Amino acid sequence: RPEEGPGGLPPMLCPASLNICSVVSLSGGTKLLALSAKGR
Amino acid sequence: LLKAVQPLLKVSMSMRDCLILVLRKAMFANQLDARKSAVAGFLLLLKNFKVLYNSVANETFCLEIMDSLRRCLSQQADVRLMLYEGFYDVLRRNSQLANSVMQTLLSQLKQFYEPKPDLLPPLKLEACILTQGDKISLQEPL
Amino acid sequence: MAVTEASLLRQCPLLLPQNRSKTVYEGFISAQGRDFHLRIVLPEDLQLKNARLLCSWQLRTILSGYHRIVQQRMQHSPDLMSFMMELKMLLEVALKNRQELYALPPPPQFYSSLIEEIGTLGWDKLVYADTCFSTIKLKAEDASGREHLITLKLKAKYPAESPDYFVDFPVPFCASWTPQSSLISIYSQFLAAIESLKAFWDVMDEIDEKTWVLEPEKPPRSATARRIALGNNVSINIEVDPRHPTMLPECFFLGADHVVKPLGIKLSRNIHLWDPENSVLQNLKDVLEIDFPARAILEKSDFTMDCGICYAYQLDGTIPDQVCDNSQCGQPFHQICLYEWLRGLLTSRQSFNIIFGECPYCSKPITLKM
Amino acid sequence: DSIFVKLLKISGIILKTGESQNQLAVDQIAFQKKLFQTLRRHPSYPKIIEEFVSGLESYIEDEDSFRNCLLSCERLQSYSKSLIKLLLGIDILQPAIIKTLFEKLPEYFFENKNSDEINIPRLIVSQLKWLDRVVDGKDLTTKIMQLISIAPENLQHDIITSLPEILGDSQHADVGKELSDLLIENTSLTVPILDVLSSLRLDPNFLLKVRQLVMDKLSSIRLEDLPVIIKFILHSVTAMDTLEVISELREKLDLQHCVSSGQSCIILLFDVIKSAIRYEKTISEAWIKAIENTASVSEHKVFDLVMLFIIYSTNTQTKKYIDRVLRNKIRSGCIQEQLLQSTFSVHYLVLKDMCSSILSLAQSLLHSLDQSIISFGSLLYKYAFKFFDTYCQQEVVGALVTHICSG
Amino acid sequence: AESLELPKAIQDQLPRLQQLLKTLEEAPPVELQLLHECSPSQMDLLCAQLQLPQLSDLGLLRLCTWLLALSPDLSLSNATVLTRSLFLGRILSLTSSASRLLTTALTSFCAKYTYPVCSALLDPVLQAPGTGPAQTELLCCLVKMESLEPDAQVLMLGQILELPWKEETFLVLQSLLERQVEMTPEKFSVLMEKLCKTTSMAYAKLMLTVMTKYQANITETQRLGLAMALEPNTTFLRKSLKAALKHLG
Ligand SMILES: [Zn+2]
Ligand SMILES: [Zn+2]
């Protein structure tokens, strides 16, 4: 931002990824590993 | 005081608008001097507050002050006679309102002038005296 | 009413006595058009010294940090009536102090009406809109062809209340808002004020271009002062009347006692030649009888106009302005640094708002007026 | 096809749409007297007036046409008076037109500064300014006053201000009385009233009466407005009115009650006083004669220092006299610590200015006997050194040394 | 007579509190945190025992100052009792315009506990007779308070709608309706219902202002009732109404 009044939220224009996982690199940027709902 | 001041006033806006605002309340006032002081202040504002801000935003402000001063031509002898001494000099340093000024004089002239020729007293001398309760006084020193 | 037979109904409409003996109250309490679930069990008698009071988890979340106040009011308070009065007013205060959690806009009027007015305006004006549609920023052009922005922050009800208008330009904008007035109305007020000031803008942009703006750097649109550089290691700052820009501004010179004098004297004698029909620069040229340097930069890229104490340019906004009255030093300083130094010295005596001392570099009399 | 429009065109005015100044084919005097004599020769001669103003009133239920009726008229042959003003040169139509003028004015309370930043209310009051004759001064007066009494502020402010053109020499004193009822009725509005009653033509005893109608409610002014009153009171001084007024005021005024806008307004206050006391030798001397006559109550207040110090700094003829009084009063078990502590805990920023003044005094006090006096002269130095500038601090230690080596 | 005892702490600490007040004619202690511990009945009893009404106007404000430093706040009730206790006699004494202090006082206090204050004072100052120039000026100044909250103005409006209306109860109401305060048609329609029942200027100004600022709120039903209300051209500035009146239909 104590914290924050509303949660107004962006998409990153990806589909429904269920079972997300994040690894924090800080090698670039943040680089994460997900499973799209269709099985990918 | 007010001659000294003006080098301030072409420079200033705030101070000019203050002087005016004050003189406004000297013109309705109770004591004698307030008027002849407020007259002297306008005469001198019109004189050197413009030859003729923007000229459109001087010709309306001058013609506003002049609207005030038509009142003073209404007021008694002392306050008039100051404007007859003053208008020559107003025109000299600020020529352009001659067309408003002269009419303003000419209208005051007409109140004493009998414009039918071969009518022998050509001037109204009997309305140029204010007599009430044996106070026999000049008003309008023609 | 007087009796809590009717006054309770009137002031807690949605509390339903569940038991015959008015011992279990249940239902809702009102607050800022919001009902909250509540079951308030009393003993067999009418005692609040001892009562139970259970909630929905929403309710407890909102009265976090007053649980003690709640317990105190239960034990100190006379009757249930005033208990609910105080509780309700307290909920009012809790929410307003967490005001940042609210503002669902009514879409059948809002999102549509706002797009309709944006249509009425035209899509060359707008520059910014938030994903929550709270903040907007718009452009207009001057006849000069300048972009002037205007931020608006709109509420759950824009047409009902005035949109808070935040604008760069210096003098305060006043917006005669009616619920009948709109974005176009206020845009037109903005254009009116714009076209009103244009002259002032013309003057400011003319100085930013043809002179070395010194103290303001990429100045914003609210700035009415302009610290201009002229000659070398002497400055003049000018603050301009927005309504009467062409009119004489407030003026003065920083720099050398020996340099600054003839500028003052020339200013005194010529100021009558000032004329508000011309531009500020075109009047300065004829009043001060000089032409200006236009960013004498690359030649003297380490000449040190800097403090000569801290050896830096730009101390916390402050600039090296105070100089030596000496041909051989001319060493600039800061007000801050020269005061801090001269305070220490034996030689230094303070009159009212002035300090006399020795210039650090050359040990000649130098004067500082705070 | 209305009597008004028809007889206006007969009398020689061009009555227009509403979008530009209405033309006039003939002289205004000729127009006025022609309209008069045409109605005179007309049947139902006192009764036509009602139909005349009925025609007028039906027309001006359009705002724009009414504005043109209010605006300066076009002169073919080169600027002239407004139509409503020109109707109001005529004695017979006047009272009714005034009545109708007044009647609807309060439609215009809320819809102000419409299109081209135009004040329909200030338009319409102005239309009365400097009538040569108003026939029924009393009727005008009583309506206009009922108007002030009811109407909201901004607008009424403008009316108030604009009262002294309007009123003829007839009725000023009447207006005098009803404003005095507004004055005791209304605190908010002491200010312009004050201006107006300064610029009207009045009896002095009346002005005295109202002056006290201030001072009883001087407790009760909103703070911003204190300054502006007090000037009046100290212009409402004669050589003979002085103690009386200062005495009441010197009691009445608090400086304790008044608490960032507070300190600014307080400064304004002392400045206004400062400017008064600057300019009346009579006031400075008399102030001090009406503090020392309150040596008796050892409950006299903060103001009775701050005034001395101010008056010492400001006025110099008095320097001996304040120091005499200050010794005589502090010897008496009056002015003490609790005062002097309180003065420099709140009123430093007032006194910051009077640096050199406090210390001229402190130097005068330590040269004395009577540890009571010298205690005060010390405490002076302690506060002086605590609160002021570094220059003041230097001067403190300077003068301390001077004692130590000589005294 | 009702045999109320103050909490034990208070009867014991009673003379500490009676000590403090004396000081304040000529930062808040924890003794003053004990005003909480008093029930308003107990407080009612105490404030009577403390002799709050006796103060200098100076002292009153200083104390208000001090009561506003309360963390936690005085409950809606004490504040009520207090205000009833502190001020009401003072207001009901008023012959002249209330002192700037009290101006300051009432503003001051009302600022924080604007509802408790004006909850307390509104009704009884108005159902009083001898209610005169000075008093009405205090209630006007209350409703022009910048603090005074939309929700609270409506609670104020809410509670003024309980009262007996005369000359004075319009003047409060106009000045509160001059702040363009939203309404249920209920409140609006009852303002109008109330309003419509008669030669007093106050009557008209109120009428005029509502017809103009609240046009947007007014049904035809209301307009007919205005029609009847100014039938009496005892009403002045009748012509003005009629325009506005007409302007709606
Ligand atoms: Zn430095
Ligand atoms: Zn040097």
Side-chain angles (χ1 to χ4, degrees):
Chain A
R1 104 89 48 273
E3 47 202 25
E4 181 217 9
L9 56 157
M12 300 78 75
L13 313 158
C14 1
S17 94
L18 85 172
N19 174 26
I20 197 166
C21 157
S22 179
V23 57
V24 185
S25 168
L26 310 188
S27 290
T30 56
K31 190 197 146 287
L32 59 84
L33 295 163
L35 175 68
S36 196
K38 306 135 163 286
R40 288 186 174 267
Chain B
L1 161 48
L2 287 164
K3 298 193 227 253
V5 153
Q6 178 141 27
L8 315 180
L9 294 176
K10 294 126 167 193
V11 159
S12 72
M13 199 58 39
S14 8
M15 192 172 327
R16 213 266 328 260
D17 83 42
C18 202
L19 182 52
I20 276 153
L21 169 58
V22 142
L23 303 160
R24 211 158 266 152
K25 295 155 210 207
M27 198 49 63
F28 306 137
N30 19 8
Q31 88 204 309
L32 169 50
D33 294 66
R35 301 262 172 67
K36 295 186 297 196
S37 298
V39 161
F42 296 125
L43 277 169
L44 283 151
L45 277 155
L46 289 179
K47 206 170 285 199
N48 337 316
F49 221 124
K50 193 161 137 285
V51 184
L52 265 73
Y53 207 81
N54 253 47
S55 188
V56 64
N58 278 91
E59 80 151 26
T60 187
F61 293 77
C62 301
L63 289 164
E64 140 187 24
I65 285 166
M66 283 283 348
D67 214 283
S68 340
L69 268 157
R70 262 166 189 115
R71 184 74 168 171
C72 293
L73 296 161
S74 89
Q75 294 190 274
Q76 70 157 306
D78 332 339
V79 193
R80 268 144 178 143
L81 176 135
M82 260 200 82
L83 307 174
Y84 304 148
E85 294 209 346
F87 283 126
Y88 178 108
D89 306 10
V90 165
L91 294 171
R92 169 166 90 267
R93 211 199 316 284
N94 182 6
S95 31
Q96 262 78 342
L97 291 168
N99 88 341
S100 174
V101 169
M102 204 68 72
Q103 288 170 152
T104 315
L105 311 183
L106 178 152
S107 57
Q108 187 91 2
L109 160 58
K110 280 296 183 71
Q111 317 203 350
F112 299 92
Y113 183 39
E114 288 87 322
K116 290 295 91 154
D118 314 12
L119 179 53
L120 220 59
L123 303 180
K124 178 49 56 188
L125 319 196
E126 294 50 46
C128 306
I129 308 163
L130 214 144
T131 302
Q132 57 192 43
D134 204 286
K135 49 166 174 198
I136 318 93
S137 130
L138 188 42
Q139 82 187 317
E140 204 286 307
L142 195 76
Chain C
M1 245 196 80
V3 69
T4 61
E5 210 174 12
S7 188
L8 169 59
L9 281 157
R10 294 297 89 76
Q11 303 183 46
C12 259
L14 308 95
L15 284 192
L16 309 169
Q18 304 304 116
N19 196 330
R20 191 188 190 204
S21 321
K22 288 196 186 103
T23 199
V24 200
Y25 285 56
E26 198 134 336
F28 296 86
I29 187 169
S30 44
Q32 182 225 332
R34 297 170 53 113
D35 285 318
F36 308 126
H37 188 190
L38 157 56
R39 57 228 120 133
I40 174 182
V41 187
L42 292 173
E44 328 313 312
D45 81 312
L46 296 217
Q47 207 186 21
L48 296 164
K49 177 54 174 296
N50 122 43
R52 292 275 291 284
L53 188 150
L54 291 82
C55 299
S56 164
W57 279 107
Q58 184 186 348
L59 186 52
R60 267 185 166 125
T61 53
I62 291 149
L63 287 204
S64 179
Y66 308 79
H67 293 248
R68 304 299 68 66
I69 313 299
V70 169
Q71 305 269 24
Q72 269 203 30
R73 303 293 77 232
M74 264 186 282
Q75 295 113 47
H76 297 139
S77 54
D79 182 306
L80 191 136
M81 176 65 229
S82 182
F83 177 96
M84 305 302 318
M85 281 300 310
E86 288 182 349
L87 167 48
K88 219 176 37 268
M89 175 193 74
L90 202 96
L91 266 162
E92 188 279 350
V93 174
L95 304 192
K96 187 194 75 216
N97 293 320
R98 309 164 95 153
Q99 178 59 96
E100 293 60 22
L101 313 174
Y102 305 72
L104 252 38
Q109 78 80 24
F110 192 95
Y111 300 104
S112 84
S113 55
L114 275 295
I115 292 159
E116 185 278 331
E117 285 191 30
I118 288 153
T120 300
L121 300 168
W123 303 61
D124 55 342
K125 319 316 186 314
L126 184 112
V127 317
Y128 180 102
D130 180 27
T131 184
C132 302
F133 208 151
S134 47
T135 298
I136 57 174
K137 318 191 303 183
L138 283 76
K139 144 199 306 198
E141 287 193 29
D142 301 349
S144 292
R146 290 173 270 242
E147 303 300 15
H148 286 226
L149 283 199
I150 191 149
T151 294
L152 307 147
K153 294 203 169 39
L154 324 177
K155 298 78 163 156
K157 286 66 50 167
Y158 153 79
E161 52 258 39
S162 307
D164 274 332
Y165 54 95
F166 303 72
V167 72
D168 54 58
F169 66 68
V171 308
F173 191 51
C174 74
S176 45
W177 172 257
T178 76
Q180 297 61 232
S181 58
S182 85
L183 295 166
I184 194 70
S185 182
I186 191 155
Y187 193 78
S188 50
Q189 297 164 33
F190 182 33
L191 272 301
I194 275 158
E195 60 71 15
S196 68
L197 298 180
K198 192 199 185 290
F200 164 78
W201 296 109
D202 299 338
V203 176
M204 287 300 116
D205 310 327
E206 175 205 352
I207 296 137
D208 287 312
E209 295 149 40
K210 306 191 183 188
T211 51
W212 188 10
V213 159
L214 190 63
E215 184 51 24
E217 58 195 351
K218 188 169 161 201
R221 294 313 214 155
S222 47
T224 65
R226 287 302 142 126
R227 195 143 149 214
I228 301 161
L230 71 179
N232 190 39
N233 238 347
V234 301
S235 185
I236 177 192
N237 52 8
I238 294 170
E239 206 175 312
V240 170
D241 180 284
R243 277 48 158 271
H244 309 261
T246 184
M247 197 58 47
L248 193 89
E250 50 275 21
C251 38
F252 62 96
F253 325 120
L254 297 78
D257 179 35
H258 66 263
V259 174
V260 168
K261 282 265 170 169
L263 290 140
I265 309 321
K266 179 184 301 180
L267 187 53
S268 84
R269 298 179 170 200
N270 307 311
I271 191 66
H272 68 111
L273 316 187
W274 187 271
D275 164 69
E277 317 275 318
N278 319 275
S279 88
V280 170
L281 301 187
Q282 182 43 63
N283 287 291
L284 287 160
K285 276 180 282 197
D286 58 45
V287 164
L288 296 172
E289 313 160 19
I290 59 123
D291 283 38
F292 293 37
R295 315 223 190 194
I297 277 162
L298 294 174
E299 300 141 302
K300 64 182 198 292
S301 70
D302 311 80
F303 101 81
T304 58
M305 59 174 160
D306 305 314
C307 203
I309 311 290
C310 61
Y311 292 145
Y313 199 74
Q314 187 18 286
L315 186 157
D316 196 331
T318 339
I319 291 304
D321 54 343
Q322 308 308 127
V323 303
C324 200
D325 56 355
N326 191 316
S327 50
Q328 306 305 321
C329 190
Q331 172 44 255
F333 297 108
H334 284 138
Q335 190 156 56
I336 286 73
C337 316
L338 179 58
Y339 170 82
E340 268 186 16
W341 173 256
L342 261 163
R343 192 126 168 92
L345 303 186
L346 168 58
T347 2
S348 62
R349 87 194 123 90
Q350 30 196 337
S351 202
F352 312 97
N353 323 306
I354 302 100
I355 294 160
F356 307 89
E358 270 83 359
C359 171
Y361 283 24
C362 66
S363 304
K364 289 290 201 154
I366 181 163
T367 315
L368 185 82
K369 296 163 278 177
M370 300 295 295
Chain D
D1 226 298
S2 167
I3 166 163
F4 172 72
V5 57
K6 279 217 305 304
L7 185 41
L8 259 74
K9 288 169 53 54
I10 290 157
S11 55
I13 168 169
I14 303 85
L15 199 73
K16 279 217 281 161
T17 69
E19 313 298 292
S20 53
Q21 45 207 342
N22 274 25
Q23 316 94 316
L24 185 70
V26 302
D27 265 318
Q28 49 263 53
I29 319 104
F31 158 70
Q32 280 202 8
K33 66 179 300 213
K34 274 160 53 182
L35 181 43
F36 155 59
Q37 67 207 19
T38 314
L39 288 157
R40 271 271 294 278
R41 293 178 198 171
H42 202 93
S44 60
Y45 147 63
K47 183 49 55 187
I48 195 155
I49 310 302
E50 287 49 43
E51 309 213 54
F52 206 91
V53 299
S54 303
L56 173 49
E57 78 195 4
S58 306
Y59 174 31
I60 68 208
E61 323 218 74
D62 172 61
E63 62 290 350
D64 296 343
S65 58
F66 173 42
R67 159 176 73 184
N68 275 33
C69 199
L70 294 158
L71 272 163
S72 159
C73 291
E74 176 58 53
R75 190 67 169 119
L76 274 85
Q77 313 85 14
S78 286
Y79 277 116
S80 64
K81 284 170 276 289
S82 162
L83 172 48
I84 287 160
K85 183 172 295 303
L86 290 161
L87 262 64
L88 283 157
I90 295 84
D91 80 307
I92 52 152
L93 269 66
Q94 147 165 344
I97 298 158
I98 309 260
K99 159 161 191 179
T100 193
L101 222 45
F102 272 34
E103 213 70 73
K104 62 176 192 316
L105 163 45
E107 296 159 15
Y108 297 87
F109 278 179
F110 319 128
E111 306 92 333
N112 290 319
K113 202 163 246 211
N114 54 341
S115 300
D116 59 312
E117 311 306 286
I118 45 166
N119 186 323
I120 324 296
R122 200 185 57 254
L123 258 321
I124 199 179
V125 57
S126 46
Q127 292 287 14
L128 308 150
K129 290 196 186 199
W130 307 328
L131 286 153
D132 165 41
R133 320 157 54 203
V134 156
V135 290
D136 55 336
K138 299 317 302 135
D139 207 26
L140 162 54
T141 320
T142 48
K143 291 169 216 284
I144 195 185
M145 283 303 322
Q146 107 201 10
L147 171 59
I148 297 158
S149 110
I150 70 206
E153 167 20 55
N154 24 72
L155 182 151
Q156 73 166 294
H157 219 265
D158 288 19
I159 318 291
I160 335 287
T161 38
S162 51
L163 296 180
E165 310 99 317
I166 291 167
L167 321 172
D169 316 332
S170 161
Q171 55 162 77
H172 298 173
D174 183 53
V175 171
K177 278 191 302 306
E178 288 88 29
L179 289 170
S180 306
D181 178 73
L182 252 299
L183 198 6
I184 64 172
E185 189 176 9
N186 247 323
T187 208
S188 41
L189 179 46
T190 192
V191 303
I193 291 201
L194 276 156
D195 177 62
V196 159
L197 300 167
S198 70
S199 53
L200 286 211
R201 297 293 325 291
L202 295 171
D203 53 337
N205 71 316
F206 165 61
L207 193 55
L208 144 72
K209 160 188 133 198
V210 62
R211 194 273 305 287
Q212 272 135 3
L213 298 180
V214 196
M215 245 177 296
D216 53 3
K217 281 152 205 165
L218 208 167
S219 38
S220 76
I221 306 301
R222 67 183 68 170
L223 183 36
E224 310 125 313
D225 293 333
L226 258 162
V228 304
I229 289 172
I230 304 151
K231 193 183 314 200
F232 163 65
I233 311 185
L234 302 160
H235 303 337
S236 73
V237 73
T238 74
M240 63 156 127
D241 185 39
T242 63
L243 271 84
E244 175 228 311
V245 62
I246 296 148
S247 314
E248 167 100 36
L249 183 57
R250 191 193 57 74
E251 157 40 62
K252 294 319 303 218
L253 266 169
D254 305 303
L255 321 197
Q256 28 178 15
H257 299 189
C258 325
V259 173
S260 300
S261 262
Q263 65 198 6
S264 306
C265 189
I266 279 166
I267 300 142
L268 264 154
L269 159 55
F270 288 124
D271 292 48
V272 182
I273 295 161
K274 275 180 192 204
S275 60
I277 67 176
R278 216 72 93 64
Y279 293 154
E280 294 200 316
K281 309 319 148 290
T282 33
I283 297 174
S284 320
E285 287 208 343
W287 210 292
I288 288 156
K289 291 150 56 50
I291 289 172
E292 56 131 57
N293 303 351
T294 318
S296 312
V297 66
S298 206
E299 205 81 20
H300 66 70
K301 278 307 316 187
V302 183
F303 186 103
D304 274 354
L305 283 181
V306 162
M307 233 31 36
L308 294 158
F309 289 160
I310 268 186
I311 289 161
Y312 199 50
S313 60
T314 291
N315 262 334
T316 45
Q317 313 319 281
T318 168
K319 276 218 174 211
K320 296 256 223 309
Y321 202 55
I322 296 137
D323 279 28
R324 158 196 301 177
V325 147
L326 202 27
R327 284 151 166 73
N328 300 351
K329 182 81 86 103
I330 195 153
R331 267 187 200 131
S332 75
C334 292
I335 326 123
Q336 316 80 354
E337 179 272 321
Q338 57 272 30
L339 293 180
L340 205 74
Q341 206 289 317
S342 61
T343 306
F344 302 58
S345 69
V346 185
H347 303 37
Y348 51 112
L349 298 101
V350 184
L351 284 169
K352 197 148 255 205
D353 327 338
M354 305 74 118
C355 169
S356 268
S357 87
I358 289 155
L359 272 61
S360 176
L361 216 160
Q363 168 153 4
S364 180
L365 290 184
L366 298 207
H367 289 150
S368 72
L369 88 170
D370 186 349
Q371 210 284 306
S372 188
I373 291 172
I374 300 126
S375 156
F376 195 60
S378 65
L379 289 156
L380 230 46
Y381 286 132
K382 278 173 236 168
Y383 310 121
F385 191 110
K386 264 194 213 150
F387 286 99
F388 288 36
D389 62 36
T390 62
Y391 170 78
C392 202
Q393 311 194 255
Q394 171 191 330
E395 294 327 305
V396 155
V397 186
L400 282 159
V401 171
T402 301
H403 305 123
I404 298 159
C405 296
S406 75
Chain E
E2 204 240 54
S3 172
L4 195 71
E5 256 196 294
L6 312 158
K8 187 41 55 199
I10 303 302
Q11 305 182 49
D12 312 338
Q13 308 277 293
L14 196 34
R16 289 142 218 242
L17 300 182
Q18 283 165 351
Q19 167 236 135
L20 294 182
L21 311 192
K22 195 171 226 299
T23 81
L24 287 154
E25 165 50 4
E26 344 282 321
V30 78
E31 290 96 310
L32 218 77
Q33 193 89 44
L34 303 200
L35 297 180
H36 298 323
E37 339 297 76
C38 265
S39 97
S41 67
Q42 296 159 6
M43 184 62 77
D44 166 323
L45 198 76
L46 171 61
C47 289
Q49 308 215 321
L50 294 180
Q51 314 290 346
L52 298 197
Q54 323 317 336
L55 302 140
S56 185
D57 285 45
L58 165 50
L60 169 47
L61 155 56
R62 272 204 215 170
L63 176 45
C64 286
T65 309
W66 255 26
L67 298 164
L68 300 156
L70 280 170
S71 215
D73 63 40
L74 288 159
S75 91
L76 178 34
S77 319
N78 263 346
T80 267
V81 149
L82 264 303
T83 307
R84 272 162 193 169
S85 185
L86 290 154
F87 299 98
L88 181 47
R90 320 189 144 283
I91 301 158
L92 301 189
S93 75
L94 275 153
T95 71
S96 292
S97 326
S99 73
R100 175 184 23 76
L101 280 161
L102 185 35
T103 318
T104 316
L106 190 18
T107 57
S108 67
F109 194 123
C110 293
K112 179 170 184 189
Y113 312 91
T114 339
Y115 176 100
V117 163
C118 329
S119 62
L121 285 159
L122 163 59
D123 349 295
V125 184
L126 265 295
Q127 308 136 353
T131 335
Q135 280 67 8
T136 56
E137 265 139 15
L138 298 221
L139 295 140
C140 82
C141 270
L142 272 183
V143 293
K144 290 170 146 65
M145 288 172 75
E146 308 65 30
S147 105
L148 175 57
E149 254 183 309
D151 326 333
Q153 285 168 75
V154 164
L155 278 158
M156 272 201 102
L157 205 63
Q159 197 180 288
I160 299 144
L161 299 159
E162 257 55 8
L163 305 173
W165 275 32
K166 51 184 142 172
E167 200 284 333
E168 276 75 10
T169 340
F170 318 154
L171 290 165
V172 168
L173 197 69
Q174 165 242 0
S175 286
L176 174 52
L177 286 166
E178 231 168 359
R179 261 197 82 184
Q180 288 118 304
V181 204
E182 305 162 309
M183 300 225 234
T184 59
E186 191 278 332
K187 289 195 297 274
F188 194 87
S189 306
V190 301
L191 155 61
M192 292 287 94
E193 152 261 26
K194 267 215 154 170
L195 169 50
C196 57
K197 310 128 184 202
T198 215
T199 188
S200 263
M201 172 74 205
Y203 196 95
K205 278 209 50 149
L206 172 57
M207 285 277 285
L208 163 33
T209 55
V210 216
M211 281 146 53
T212 67
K213 290 166 189 299
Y214 289 80
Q215 293 177 335
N217 315 295
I218 312 212
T219 89
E220 186 55 19
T221 328
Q222 284 86 58
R223 218 190 42 73
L224 274 56
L226 304 171
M228 316 335 282
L230 316 159
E231 279 186 309
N233 290 216
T234 201
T235 60
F236 302 164
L237 335 172
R238 322 101 255 253
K239 262 203 67 239
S240 346
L241 293 136
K242 290 169 220 260
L245 193 72
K246 161 181 171 186
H247 173 122
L248 293 151

